[PDB]
Design a protein around this ligand. Structure first.
Ligand SMILES: [Ca+2]
Ligand SMILES: [Ca+2]
Ligand SMILES: [Ca+2]
Ligand SMILES: [Ca+2]
Length: 239
């Protein structure tokens, strides 16, 4: 639009140029990492008699109260000012109220929303009740245990290892995001895992080392948020 000589201002518009959302995912396509605002003064006939985006000040709550934290910055290019709202350390998702002032006078408010569309492990199931290790497992049950699980995201799609990345197993990473611990029925055969970070992501995953030949039940326990029930898998580690 253009600013034009018109009549006296009748009202102010706080205009959202984009979708009004900020996606704190690290990979969303297309990138969705801001909200962009204009503030216009308009006369009785809708003529834009002022672009006051550069003159106003936009703020959010001084002390955080909802785990949603945003920054507001005036960005000027091509003669035009856009008020750019960005995520700044939001721990949660949800709405954040912006207040738009001209000097000390409030012109209005507008909410922005922080979202997160990251693919998230949502369903985990076991394929078989039992797995048996052989020499290829090199005395560690983790690879064969992972192969015995199916992980689905919130869309119900599989979460699997990408062969494009040789040194990180995306499926293991998906598991660890919802796993709280692994209990072994006999820690002398295979140790229990209480710190899930000890499930080592690498070209060759590891962390369920066999201490001696035998048979154990491994029970996977998941976090409360996921609501996934424990999964028990019997592991035979033959001599
Ligand atoms: Ca946006
Ligand atoms: Ca993002
Ligand atoms: Ca907040
Ligand atoms: Ca990979």
């Amino acid at each position: 639009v253009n600013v034009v000589a018109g009549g006296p201002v009748a009202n102010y518009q706080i205009k959202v140029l984009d979708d009004g959302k900020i996606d704190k995912s690290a990979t969303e396509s297309p990138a969705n990492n801001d909200v962009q605002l204009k503030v216009y003064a308009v006369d009785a006939n809708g003529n834009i008699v002022g672009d006051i985006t550069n003159d106003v000040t936009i703020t959010s709550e001084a002390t955080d109260t909802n785990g949603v934290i945003v920054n507001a910055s005036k960005s000027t290019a091509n003669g035009d000012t856009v008020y750019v709202i960005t995520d700044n350390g939001s721990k949660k998702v949800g709405k954040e109220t912006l207040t738009v002032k001209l000097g000390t006078v409030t012109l209005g408010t507008v909410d922005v929303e922080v979202i997160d569309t990251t693919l998230k492990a949502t369903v985990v199931t076991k394929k078989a009740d039992l797995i048996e290790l052989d020499a290829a497992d090199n005395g560690d049950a983790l690879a064969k245990l992972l192969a015995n699980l199916d992980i689905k995201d919130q869309n119900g799609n599989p979460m699997v290892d990408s062969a494009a990345t040789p040194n990180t197993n995306e499926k293991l990473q998906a598991l660890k995001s919802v796993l709280s611990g692994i209990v072994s029925s006999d820690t002398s055969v295979i140790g229990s895992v209480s710190n899930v970070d000890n499930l080592k992501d690498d070209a060759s995953i590891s962390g369920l080392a066999v201490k001696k030949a035998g048979t154990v039940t491994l029970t996977l326990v998941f976090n409360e948020d996921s609501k996934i029930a424990p999964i028990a898998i019997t592991v035979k580690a033959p001599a």
